[PDB]
Amino acid sequence: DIVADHVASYGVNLYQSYGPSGQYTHEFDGDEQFYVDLGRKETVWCLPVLRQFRFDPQFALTNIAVLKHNLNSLIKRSNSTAATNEVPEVTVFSKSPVTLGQPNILICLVDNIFPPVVNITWLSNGHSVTEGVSETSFLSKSDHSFFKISYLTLLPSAEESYDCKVEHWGLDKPLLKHWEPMSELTETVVCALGLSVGLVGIVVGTVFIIRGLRS
C-alpha cells in the first residue's frame, strides 16, 4: 500500500465484454473530476470550477481502444476466466438533516460492485420515479471494485416513503433499501398562558382602582 497526502488517478480506463461498454474518468482524492461520454464524444465536467480547462474527448477513445485489444489477448491466456460476481452493499441516507418541506437529496450508495453492471432505481410506494434522479460514474476502489451513487431530489413528506432498488448479477433477487422520514399539548399550553395573562391584566386594572380608592 501507498500512504500520501493526496491521491490522483488520471488514467482510470474501463472496458468490458458485456456491452461492449467502457468508461473514462479522472479522480482526485476520491471524487470524480469529469467523464468522457464515449458515444457522444463529449467531456462532461463534474465540478463547476473545473470547466475552465480542456480535455480532448478523442484522447479517451484512443485509450479504451487499446484496452479492448489488450482484453482479447488476455482472455486467451487466462483460458476464459469469467468475472466472479460479487454481492453489492447498499446504503441509503439523507444528504442533509431531514426537515419536512425543505428540499433534500437522497443518497443511495452501492458498494463492492463487480462487474460494473448495475441497475439503480428509486421506488415511491411501489411506483418507479423518473424525476430528479441522477447517478455518478463507477468510481474506483483499491481492491479493484467499484461504487456508484444515485441521487433523488425529493421534497420530504411525512406520508411518503422511498426505496432504492439495486439489481445486480450477484443478488438472487433484487435488493431494496428502505428510507422513511404535540397539537393537544400546544393548545393546552397556549390556553394556559392566555387565561393567566388575561387574569394578570385584570388584576392590575382592579388594583389600580383599589390603590386609587384609598386616596
Binding site: 461520454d37 458515444g39 437529496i105 430528479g132 441522477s134 431530489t153
Partner: protein, 70 residues
C-alpha cells in the same frame, strides 16, 4: 341608569370586531400555506437546475432519402 346600557353596546361591538379579526387571521393562513408550497416547489426546481443526468447509450434515428427527377 343608562350608563350600563351604554357599556352593553360597546362590549357587543367589541366582540363583533374580534370575530372580524379572527376571520381575516384565518383567511391569511390559507395564503401562507399556499405560498409556502409554491416557495418550496420553486426551491426544488433550483436544486434540479444544478444536477445533470447520466447519459444513456447513443442510438441514431433513421431517415429516408428522396430521389432525383432524372
Amino acid at each position: 341608569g343608562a350608563l350600563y346600557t351604554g357599556f352593553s353596546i360597546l362590549v357587543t361591538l367589541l366582540l363583533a370586531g374580534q370575530a372580524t379579526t379572527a376571520y381575516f387571521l384565518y383567511q391569511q393562513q390559507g395564503r401562507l400555506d399556499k405560498l409556502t408550497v409554491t416557495s418550496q416547489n420553486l426551491q426544488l426546481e433550483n436544486l434540479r437546475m444544478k444536477l445533470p443526468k447520466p447519459p444513456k447509450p447513443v442510438s441514431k434515428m433513421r431517415m429516408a432519402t428522396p430521389l432525383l427527377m432524372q
